[PDB]
Design a protein around this ligand. Sequence first.
Ligand SMILES: Cn1cc(/C=C2\C(=O)Nc3ccc(Cl)cc32)cn1
Ligand SMILES: [Cl-]
Length: 260
Amino acid sequence: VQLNQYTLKDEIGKGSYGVVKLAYNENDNTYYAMKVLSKKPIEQVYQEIAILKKLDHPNVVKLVEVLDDPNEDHLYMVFELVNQGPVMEVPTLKPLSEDQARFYFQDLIKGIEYLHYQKIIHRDIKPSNLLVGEDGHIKIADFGVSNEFKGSDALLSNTVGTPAFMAPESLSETRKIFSGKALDVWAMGVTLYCFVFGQCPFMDERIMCLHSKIKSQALEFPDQPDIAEDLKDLITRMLDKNPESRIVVPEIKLHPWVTR
Ligand SMILES: Cn1cc(/C=C2\C(=O)Nc3ccc(Cl)cc32)cn1
Ligand SMILES: [Cl-]
């Protein structure tokens, strides 16, 4: 299976809409990550390509090129390979230590700050989208449902992303408008909870009940593992159900748990 200079190898991950395969470039003798898409909507993908083309940051995955044939049903996005894969799998019985969670969370902060400055809402922040590169640092991946905005913030109404990480204000049943940056903060909070507990803070196999818990269940910390009180404070502020009082990224950067 060869596509121009690339030989397609085995699957390595899930992308938004498609699959991600390891790929070998015969021109430069180098492995890449290739997202394969079958046209089944397509406007969302070219916005993703358009977003990826504008981005250049150490904590954000790089799009290398796009293989688009108006003849073939398949479309190929070639990314840099982030060789060590996701930072963790959720759920797990072996979560990160606090020191590891802080190390990775610092990369997540820098990446999100950059995305928001570039006027991008990621909308699908979660551990499986935080890939560990050759030097051990995080690269944010999967911009399949991301939004670009003008001005100070996005004003959104559509519900997209991974359900366990969706912010409560995005789950109104009345097409209400909500702002974008606070959505990424909420998902960063679910992610940090995942880092140290190995499972999501709101869980239910019934999607109605999952939504109801995100919107209405008080955050609860498990007795074990016993995490520091300032980390509990930071998670609590990021998982504030009210997006208006939810901690903002400039404050996360200063939080005493982050800076120690
Ligand atoms: C070792 N490993 C790599 C992956 C996946 C990816 C990778 O490397 N670059 C990517 C760029 C964009 C997307 Cl959406 C996914 C990946 C999974 N496991
Ligand atoms: Cl995940």
